[PDB]
Amino acid sequence: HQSYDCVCVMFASIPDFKEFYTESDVNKEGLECLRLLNEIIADFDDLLSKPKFSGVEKIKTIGSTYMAATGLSQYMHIGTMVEFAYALVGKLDAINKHSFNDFKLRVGINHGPVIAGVIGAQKPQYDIWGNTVNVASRMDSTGVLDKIQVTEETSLILQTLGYTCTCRGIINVKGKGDLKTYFVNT
């Protein structure tokens, strides 16, 4: 297992889901809730097989948080991740139509050096580590619904590729301090 240099990490969680989760005899003690979640994630997995998303490598899923990365295979890989993150919205919206719900996805996207590999000799599973990731996650959680939050670096890169950015303000990243953040325009 090896290191890398320019990997684009995206976290997309679903804040509205934790509320929607119930445990009652009617929903078979939270099974039906987890059943819709399956349908949603499975819709998100139906995007990786697409051709323009062949570069997207899904890492794992934290509860309702979908975690993926591009560039594990110049900066076109950062743009892809956005077209992907857009796509999840189309997939999460689709569900809403049929499921009479109002889920909104919240997207944090960062980039930089990461280390990718296997951890533990029990069940070997693929995972990426380092600062780049930690920020990616921290930008999701401090994000706004229907909006993609990006760092100052990513702000710039997307501006070359024709995406416009609106400054969120400043964030206290645990260990990296105050820093400027951005939203891509719908």
């Binding site: 009617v26 929903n27 809730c33 049929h98 009479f100």
Partner: protein
């Protein structure tokens, strides 16, 4: 031998009643709590009518301005939490309900949000006020309490098992529906047939029937419901005829396509039924069937029934037509 039925339909559509009817028909201290509920229905029925009187366009005036004070009594108690329901209340209520100007307001009710049981309870106030009052079965049927959440009710019919799931018809309630989508025998979809001249509680603008149709189209074309048939319940059939025969408000004025419509050949009208009613009730059914023909492809079908939910004599009948359908619609 166990079937799980799920009751869907917009708010006030009739779901809650249908279950009540099953308790009547096929099931077995407790009612004293419901007596309170019935009184509540009464309170808010009259208090809503009076409140509407001024905000209506044009406004409606009392036929006896003596009643102005009673009108003031009603609005003074409108929001009072645990109301004592004193004998004053009933006296002033009847007085107003007697007042012709107040009745004129009720006769224009479709222009504001008013429960279905208003007239029914108001007409029997001297019955309700008694301290040893016991509600009739029909009184239990007509008593309106909004359902929030999912409530299962099991029962047995000729050694066959049913699981009925009552849900909330309103929009913030439609999210919970999902939990009953998997492993369902069929949908019972209920519709306020009579509510063609009305808007919804949710936003005071969207037409109730037009809402029910769009909600239906959602269910009929749902990704998790592709193989489930939907037993359509066109409810409030009494109230429809009442409105059609009254002819005060018209259908072609809310749904202009009705002007075109003529009555179908396969018409099976009830004995002594006015053609006008026949023409109206089947038009409504046909609007719904246009959604059950565009998609489905013989993977799931639709079974209409004209139903009056507060008619136990009609519910046995229609639910018997349904038992016939399910016996082969689990094979």
């Amino acid at each position: 031998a166990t079937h799980r039925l799920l009751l869907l339909g917009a708010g006030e559509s009739g779901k809650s009643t249908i279950v009540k009817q099953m308790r009547i028909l096929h099931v077995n201290g407790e009612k004293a709590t419901k007596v309170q509920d019935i009184k509540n229905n009464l309170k808010e029925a009259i208090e809503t009518i009076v409140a509407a009187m001024s905000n209506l366009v044009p406004p409606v005036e009392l036929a006896n301005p003596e009643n102005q004070f009673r009108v003031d009594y009603i609005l003074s108690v409108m929001n009072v939490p645990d109301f004592d329901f004193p004998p004053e209340f009933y006296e002033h209520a009847k007085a107003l309900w007697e007042d012709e100007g107040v009745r004129a307001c009720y006769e224009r009710s479709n222009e504001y949000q008013l429960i279905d049981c208003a007239q029914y309870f108001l007409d029997k106030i001297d019955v309700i006020k008694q301290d040893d009052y016991v509600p009739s079965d029909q009184d239990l049927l007509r008593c309106r309490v909004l359902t929030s959440g999912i409530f299962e009710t099991k029962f047995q019919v000729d050694k066959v098992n049913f699981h009925m799931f009552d849900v909330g018809g309103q929009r913030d309630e439609r999210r919970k529906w999902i939990q009953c989508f998997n492993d369902v025998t069929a949908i019972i979809f209920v519709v306020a047939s009579s509510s063609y001249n009305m808007v919804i509680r949710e936003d005071n603008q969207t037409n109730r029937l037009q809402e029910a149709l769009n909600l239906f189209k959602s269910i009929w074309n749902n990704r998790w419901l592709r193989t489930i048939s939907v037993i359509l319940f066109l409810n409030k059939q009494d109230l429809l005829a009442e409105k059609v025969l009254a002819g005060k408000s018209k259908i072609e004025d809310y749904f202009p396509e009705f002007a075109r419509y003529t009555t179908p050949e396969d018409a099976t009208p009830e004995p002594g039924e006015d053609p006008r009613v026949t023409r109206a009730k089947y038009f409504i059914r046909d609007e719904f069937l246009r959604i059950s023909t565009a998609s489905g492809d013989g993977r799931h079908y639709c079974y209409p029934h004209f139903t009056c939910a507060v008619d136990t004599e009609n519910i046995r009948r229609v639910f018997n037509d349904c038992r016939d359908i399910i016996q082969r619609m689990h094979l």
